[PDB]
Amino acid sequence: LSFDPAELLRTSLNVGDIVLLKQCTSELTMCVNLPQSTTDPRYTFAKKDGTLVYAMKNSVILRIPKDPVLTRQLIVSFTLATFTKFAWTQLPIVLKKLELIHRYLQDSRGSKHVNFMSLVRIIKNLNIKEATINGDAYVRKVIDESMSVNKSIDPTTLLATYWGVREQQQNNLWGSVYTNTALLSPTTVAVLPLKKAHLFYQEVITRLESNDYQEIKAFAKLVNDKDYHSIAKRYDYIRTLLNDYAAGNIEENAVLTTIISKIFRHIDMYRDQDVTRSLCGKLLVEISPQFILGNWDLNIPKSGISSVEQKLYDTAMPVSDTDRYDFGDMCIDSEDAHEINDIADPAGLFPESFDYTKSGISDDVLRVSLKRAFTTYLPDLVVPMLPKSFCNRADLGDRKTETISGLHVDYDLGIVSNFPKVTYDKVDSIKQKKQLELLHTLATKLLHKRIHDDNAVFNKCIPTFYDQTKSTLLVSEFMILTNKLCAAFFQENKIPGVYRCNQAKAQFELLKEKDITKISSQLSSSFYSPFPLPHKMIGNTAYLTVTSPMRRGPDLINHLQLHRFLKKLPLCFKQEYLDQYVWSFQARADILKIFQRHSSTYWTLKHLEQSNGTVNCLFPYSYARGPRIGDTKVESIHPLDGIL
Amino acid sequence: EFKKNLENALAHVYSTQIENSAPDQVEFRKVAWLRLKDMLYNQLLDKNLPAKINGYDPGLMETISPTQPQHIIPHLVKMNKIKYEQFQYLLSSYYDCILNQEIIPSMLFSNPAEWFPEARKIRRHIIMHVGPTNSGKTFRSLQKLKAADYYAGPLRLLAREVYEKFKHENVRCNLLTGEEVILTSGTIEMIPLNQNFDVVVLDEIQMMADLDRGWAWTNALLGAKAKEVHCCGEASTIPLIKKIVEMTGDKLTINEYERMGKLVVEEEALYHSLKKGDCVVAFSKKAILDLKLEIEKKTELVIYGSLPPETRVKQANLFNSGEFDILIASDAIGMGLNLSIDRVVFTTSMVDMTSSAIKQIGGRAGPVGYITAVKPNVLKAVREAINAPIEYLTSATTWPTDEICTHVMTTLLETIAADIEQNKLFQICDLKARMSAIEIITFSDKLRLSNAPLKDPLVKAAFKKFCDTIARGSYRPFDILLEEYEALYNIIMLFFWLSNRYPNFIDQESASELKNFCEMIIFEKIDHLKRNPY
RNA sequence: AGAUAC
């Protein structure tokens, strides 16, 4: 009655998969059918009652690997009812356990994410009687023993845990549950600080309901009398509340929303108007001087932990092995580019690179860097994965530069110093140049090879909009090549690494041979893995990313593995930690993807404001989405809400 | 260094000063303090063996974020950054972390409008069409409802009536009842509370104060995600709705309607003076109904609540023709069928009838209607009830939705309804029938079915067989060529309830034919009714 | 929603 999580990595959505759907969140369902046409790519699921449910793939909340609409099929009835009854029965105890370890895993300074599967593991492995003698150590012993490994998970506990977290989400004990789209499984969940989120909101609710919502009525009076100073000093907890709403931090607690409805309802100018995130924002500007950034999941500092860590990054300063190759007397980026990696050796800046004395990750900047799985790049702002000092030092830019740096492919720490001033545009434009021409032609040969031999292979305080060159063909092709070759080196040397991985199907393949919209609801997505898998978009070979060590954590880890290995030391990471780290990376990449698309939608729509039963549409404007699918004035637009 | 000792002194003192601020659970801070000091003393005292082993190790980032306070002192010693300020600050931070760890261990449903946050999150408008029966109150709202792009009725018959009228106007309106599925028209109990429409109509809104049925009207009123919510009913509903609209912030526009036609109570009635167009009202006391109708038939020249709908319609048409002259009704005449009744005759007045019920029955003679009693004492009691002012309802009855009491699970409702009581203008259901059905695995459906209908045990045995048929995850019932036919009809209908709820009971169309067989036979049995079970 | 640069 347990299953291995690796088969999620090893499999895609399939018949027999047991899932929870967003429509039918309160009951388990079973995948009974695949997408039926190019025209309609939705899935079919059967409930325990035998009723069908049709849903888009992204509606899957969690997934269990297997272990024409004939009404007669007990098979499903039996699986779903059995696991559901058991989870349901297991649940109240799970709620108590969740409350308790929330008390222990939570950090008062701020929001802190956890591998969700790990959480499930913890919930399974804890006995309440023992959890009360030699307690606190028993628990942290059950948390380390959580990590210890087999790796298998009970489905029932998984479901019960999910339900438990949502119910306690109503109390602001946990944050939103994030589900990875590739594996269609939950990756991570944030744990909100008890003092700041539970007690604070609870106090606010009592304060606001007190004396028949006296504080609310009095406030709406103040807003109506426009004496905002008193609001400022006396009622800043309400500004806090509206802000927390705007960030999408408390969007799911119904009570804070009814409370806020009463607040808006009592204020004259906004009276009788829709309760939206946008409205809380507009309302806030009308009261504060000079909102997506407020999101707790967006690890922005403004957040006490992100502020502590950024205080570390501000305050930080970094034995180069003579065993390094000298490249002697031998980079297409934007003008406004921050780190130039094209490969830099940030791993060298860490003691872990050479110190096999201490197991695991011991260094503070390294540990923080790994928590931020990537550099965070947004049109609004940038949060570099590495501190500024270290990026300034390690960036490759006439400078002594420490480094790691038909057709046939010849399978069989550095220093560099001559650096030419160049840009993507500059590269596109026109002896060294001849070398470059040879390179572009070579790149075209690489792409042609990948295409014909490997069966290899969407654009567009002041918002601006824009919409692939020879230069881009060049860089992308050589990056893909480098990463494949290093995949091969790691595999051949048996080095554990973080890897990157009907009529409708025929129509898709034909379309493969404009209107990529129709192909788009049949998409595969990337996922990180502790074991090698082909990246079937790029080719038929394993794919291991080493090209971006300063903005991607997995590359950085790959760099540490190379450093230890090349100097014939024991490797930094055994496969098991590789897996853990990989899970955290996937979580933070997904999270970033979500908030990136959120921010782009917000700004696009805000520009618009400044200027298959689905009723989905698109603009020419890529991120403005609101019978003949794929074929080619609205009422309302509220960007913060994502409403169009 | 004794200097450092003095530093720890003034530092800890400074911490006391920063631990004398608020009384709002200052005790936690106190305990944090004692644990602090104790941890220091213990540190140096136990250090007797690891004094230097302590004093060997420096710090880094933990100095800005006091990670592990399992050992403070050695770090304070070996501190070297590039003055006392470092000391006081660092220890203050440490204390804060101790408060993170110590203000954490072992230290520890009357707003139903809140149950519909999505509805509370939008402007909702209430239009109250208030008045007597026979006032035109329903038509303005129904016409507003058509031009839109849902109707909630109390009865399958009224839902049918609106369906029929809409179909005759060329407009595809589906039907959704407990038993029948064809804009949308339904019973109030079948209303979806998650489909953001544009207009909802709630008829007979005063049935919100039914002790047994009233939750659906309250729930629909509070929870319907509609731009306009039109409520039609009597004026006895107005103050609560204002109080209700007070809790939603929703604008309330009231529209008042008077009787379209006059009505009067006669002096004294003369049973031979019963007359064509007389309706003799016997309540659900079908034994009384049956006996009276057979007697009055046996001289010169029937609708009750437990009759099937088709039979009732046939009875109305027959009555509207001179193949039928008088009619006996029940309080089931209070609503439904559109009937041409000249004169109401009350058979009787075991509790007394409410003033409201008398008014509701009497207003169906709608332009001069007449009312009287069989017995003079009742005649005057009726004149009193009839002339009694608009009694106002004090409260609105409520029931937890599926979602909420599933959340409560986390006979539990004994407790839920008790704490619901333990707000002030909200009622708890009776649910005595529901608890009865609860006398009887899935839990969710057990709730979902605890609202299924039956009598007070043939209905109970059929229900058992149904629960058993649920546990395995339809015939035992023969008639060919009276109390038995009414019971069988109710079981075939119950079957229709589950089939409309669980298309995985299959009989369907063929079972519809079976229903008509119970109906014709009951009809013919009632027309030819030569005796009657009293 | 895939890929490189950031």
UniProtKB/TrEMBL annotation, chain A:
This is Exoribonuclease II, mitochondrial. GO terms for biological process: mitochondrial RNA catabolic process; mRNA catabolic process. One of its GO terms (cellular component) is P-body. Residues 324-568 form the RNB domain. Pfam families: RNB. GO terms for molecular function: exoribonuclease II activity; RNA binding. It comes from the Eukaryota. PANTHER family: EXORIBONUCLEASE II, MITOCHONDRIAL, RIBONUCLEASE. InterPro entries: NA-bd_OB-fold, RNase_II/R, RNR_Ribonuclease. The lineage of its organism: Eukaryota, Fungi, Dikarya, Ascomycota, Saccharomycotina.
TrEMBL record, chain B:
One of its GO terms (molecular function) is exoribonuclease II activity. GO terms for cellular component: mitochondrial degradosome. One of its GO terms (biological process) is mitochondrial RNA 3'-end processing. It catalyses: ATP + H2O = ADP + phosphate + H(+). Its EC number is 3.6.4.13. SMART domains: DEXDc, HELICc. Residues 118-244 form the Helicase ATP-binding domain. Its main location: mitochondrion. CDD domains: DEXQc_Suv3 (cd17913), SF2_C_suv3 (cd18805). Belongs to the helicase family. PANTHER family: ATP-DEPENDENT RNA AND DNA HELICASE, ATP-DEPENDENT RNA HELICASE SUPV3L1, MITOCHONDRIAL-RELATED. This is ATP-dependent RNA helicase SUV3, mitochondrial. It comes from Candida glabrata (strain ATCC 2001 / BCRC 20586 / JCM 3761 / NBRC 0622 / NRRL Y-65 / CBS 138). The lineage of its organism: Eukaryota, Fungi, Dikarya, Ascomycota, Saccharomycotina.
